[PDB]
Write a protein that binds this ligand. Sequence first.
Ligand SMILES: [Zn+2]
Ligand SMILES: [Zn+2]
Ligand SMILES: [Zn+2]
Lengths: 111, 196, 56, 175, 64, 48, 227, 161, 208
Amino acid sequence: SFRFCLECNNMLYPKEDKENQRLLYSCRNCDYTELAEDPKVYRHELITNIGETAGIVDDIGQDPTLPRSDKECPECHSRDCVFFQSQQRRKDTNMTLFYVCLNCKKTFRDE
Amino acid sequence: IKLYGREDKGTGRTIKATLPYVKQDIPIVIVFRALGVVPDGEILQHICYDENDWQMLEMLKPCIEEGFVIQDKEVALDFIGRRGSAALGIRREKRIQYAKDILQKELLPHITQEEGFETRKTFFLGYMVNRLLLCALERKDQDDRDHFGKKRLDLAGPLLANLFRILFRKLTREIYRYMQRCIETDRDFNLNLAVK
Amino acid sequence: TKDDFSPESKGFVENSYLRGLTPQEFFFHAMAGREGLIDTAVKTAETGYIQRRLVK
Amino acid sequence: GSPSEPIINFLEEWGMEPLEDYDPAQHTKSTRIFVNGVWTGIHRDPSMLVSTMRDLRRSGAISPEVSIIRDIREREFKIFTDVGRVYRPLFIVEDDESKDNKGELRITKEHIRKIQQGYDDDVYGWSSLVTSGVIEYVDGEEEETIMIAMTPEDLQTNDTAKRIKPEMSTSSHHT
Amino acid sequence: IKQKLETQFTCLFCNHDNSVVCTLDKKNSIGLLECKKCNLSFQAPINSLSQPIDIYSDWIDACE
Amino acid sequence: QSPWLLRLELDRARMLDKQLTMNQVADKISEVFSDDLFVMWSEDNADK
Amino acid sequence: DTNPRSQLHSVERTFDEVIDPRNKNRLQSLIHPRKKIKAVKAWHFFPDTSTFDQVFHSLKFVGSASLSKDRPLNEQLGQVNASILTSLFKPIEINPHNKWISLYAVTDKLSAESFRKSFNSIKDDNIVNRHVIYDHIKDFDQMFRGHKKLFEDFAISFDDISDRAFFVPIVGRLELKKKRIVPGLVDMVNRTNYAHIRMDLRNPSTQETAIRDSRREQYDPVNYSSI
Amino acid sequence: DDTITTEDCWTVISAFFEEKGLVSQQLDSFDEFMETSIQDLVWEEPRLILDQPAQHDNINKRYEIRFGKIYLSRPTMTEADGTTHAMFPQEARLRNLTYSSPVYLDMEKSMFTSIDGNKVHIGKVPIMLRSKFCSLRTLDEVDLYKMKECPYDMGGYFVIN
Amino acid sequence: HTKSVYDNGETLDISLPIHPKSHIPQGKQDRWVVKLPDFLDINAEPFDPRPFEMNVKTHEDKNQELLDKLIAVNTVRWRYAKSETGGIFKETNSQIIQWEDGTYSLRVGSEIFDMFTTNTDDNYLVSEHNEEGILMTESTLSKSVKLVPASFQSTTHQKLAKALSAKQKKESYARSVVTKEDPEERQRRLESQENERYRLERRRKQAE
Ligand SMILES: [Zn+2]
Ligand SMILES: [Zn+2]
Ligand SMILES: [Zn+2]
């Protein structure tokens, strides 16, 4: 998540003040500049796990084509649950199941 | 809407859109500003729907960096018009009008054709870019080409309609040519002779 | 149902020809037979070209 | 092929809100709505909308060949009135939980005897079956989102000659 | 690196066609249009996405 | 020297599987970049 | 029931079956057809007589032009703020191609509060000369969409003491977006708008009031027809 | 109620085939094309406009012709001698004719002038057999034998030459 | 620091005429913008039974007539009601009902239409002053409200469904006709006449 100029709406780029030795975010079409809070200017993940469990919707229990199991919900302890494998579909994706209850909709595994 | 740049190749992964009656590909930020959405925050709102998805944001960063040169609607329209494969030497005002013509019409015609109705086109461009990035990030399988629910069958109706449209356009052109030829005499043509 | 890796859900015909095939097994077996027909009708031309080049 | 104007009118009447009233930050959970491939609006309660559209199609108000698809995973609700889509008829199983007839075929012997007679008891043919909500057409894209039984015997839970039915033990229960 | 390209544009002073050559220097961000017959030189700034059509349009606007 | 810090985290599991040493990686980087980059590496007993 | 007599009879039947808001028992008798839930409170639905002469437009900010998004603007104008509730808009068009909107507001909270109280309490014929000065804040690009039908949109206002609900027509919708002024046109920009605007409150003239009454005579002729 | 058996499924399928038939898609598509598609194809470009600023006294004359309704007829045969009569598919097959019907279009001509037309025949469209515009859609069972047409014939094809 | 562009200080001494309001909002200057459905109409004019009865229109098209009947019976109206004490009062046929869940519904006669509210920010209502070319704000439009029929069994919904279902059933553009002669006869006879007058014109021009 990156921020934008509050008066120009354009993207703010990181900058360093030579005299102050501080990190700043400065727009390019305007003189607006704001102090940087975090030092993590850039991050790149070679191996990532996002998109595995993020694929959750509140009304996934209304799908009739999804199998229904009897795994115990940690939160609601309901007798009815719906499970599915990982939404991320890379060639080396694990086959672990994600179980969703009909009340709390918490995603969990059998591991 | 092509996504240039291979894995760890081609420097930035720029996105260039292809428009009808335009000779060269155009970066997506430029066409977005051409439709009339100049700030970058609004463009990101149009494309993405989850600010926490930093992966698609970092994929979009090179496109914004490339398109940063253009910062106004009229200049973007002029850039689109310059490559519009029209007559050479067209004036700037006529170039902008030609760009407006080629942007309102012939660009996603199935959505709309009337004026002041281009927000939907911007939203559909956002949807297309979202789908392209989503498949590029391997989050979804590429659309199946053999999926029989995405096919259509042309029965006698559509086939005869296409053929009749062609033949009727030919007949209309013949009537037009005969009218031009026969007005020179300034005669009251029966209009039953113009048709063939 | 979605995400079903059971043998009968991915094309294992449990029955025999004498016993008869259920509709799902019938469709899967038809898919396999179509693949066989296509493979024959396609490889024949490639093999013919190869043999002609060898003879020449 | 059918005109899409009645579909848009029904969608607007039943709470769909157009694109100019849409902000991605605000409606972070709303469902998009496509009609013949164009994004026309958004909706916040897609379940009641799809139920209403399906009931309207079954009652004959909408043309029975109109395709109504809900993609819950992708948060989309697509509608097709295009020309050239291959469909096929299917029986309809009463899937309403609140109904006593849950999990049973809607068609009964009364419909069969009406068909055999040829008239209703205050012409009764195939179209009457389709518009009375016991049979409906589905195309190749709507089939992605339905669960079909092979035979009416499948709707309820040692011979060397008869064939073997699938066990289907992966699912504790089916709807 | 200066890039010299022959273009099919029309000079507005000599009226000879196919006698226009576009010289753009990306290092200094400049583009020069020279008439092979009139020997007139037109200079205009260029950007990273500039093309000979851009400099030609700039020359047309400057002419009018 | 520049204030810009460039760091990267190595997967301990695969690093052990490939039977590699942090010193070896640092030496390879130093050899390919001479003295143009100052490099520090965490010990093998670090959590990451 | 295509008979005109049947339609008229349906009209009077609908008129006669209006539930008295004070009747608690009859209100509780009414039940939602689907929710099966009793009614709590009711309001009469009436049009507004004093406001039909005026023209109402729904004004909205699109995208980054949101006042909430503009943090320095909100801080300057106050974090409902009476300054927003008393803002002025000035549409100026140099040419068909070039158009924008000018926004003005009262920076002082006390002056804005006094002006808002005076404006919202106009029920008598004595208005104090409130020479309020409005300061320019920002300019936005504008687009307009018109309603084909008169009452395509209507805004509903409530009045609990009278148990009524007054609705007013909406003529069109105006959208505003943030506009970055070109550096080459600031010379003409400084000659277009103004740093301040002074508003003086005066009682409406007799002729203008008569014109407005004549305009309103289309809706309500019992209390406004000329004699 | 009572359970539904396989025989009831076959009763339903029999009802389906009693209403639809086996070539219903061809006939339905052709009926849709003839009923509405031709008119819309014509109205896609409903105006031909010519203008002329005559100075030969500035007289700007605009000559515009508009396309109106589409009129269709039953297939008809016009002999060499001149007589015209209704045509049935068997005669077309035997005589190597084409089973087609004339199409008539209304053209309205306007002469706009500022100083500053009936059913014309445009062609013959072949008719799909047993469709709504075929002569065999009527005629019941008995007359189908007098016309030397097989009652088992299902239509859905054209007769060209 | 984006310096203020305008520093001339020029000021206009414009005075606006304002009229007293028949009502004043209490506690909040909030209003709800509501889109008008096709099956619901607003009749601001006072109800006049005699012109209404004398102006009822009958059409051959059943769908159009049914739609007009539905919109007329569902139209919001008002009329002057003579009080039993001799006074005159404004009487309306429309009411707003709030249920126990807090939802709101628009009621016309026995018909009930639910309201779906979506919160909208930075949306305000203004008053247009065309003679002075300035816009004066009125209040804030906090929520956008959609009107939805309560249930399937509602008569309005059933009438709408009937009208829309039978509207798309009628589709027949081409009109049949009977050909009595050769369709090509006009062309050939007119070509013969044109060739005849061509020959006559050529002879005249050669003799002229
Ligand atoms: Zn900026
Ligand atoms: Zn639970
Ligand atoms: Zn020259």
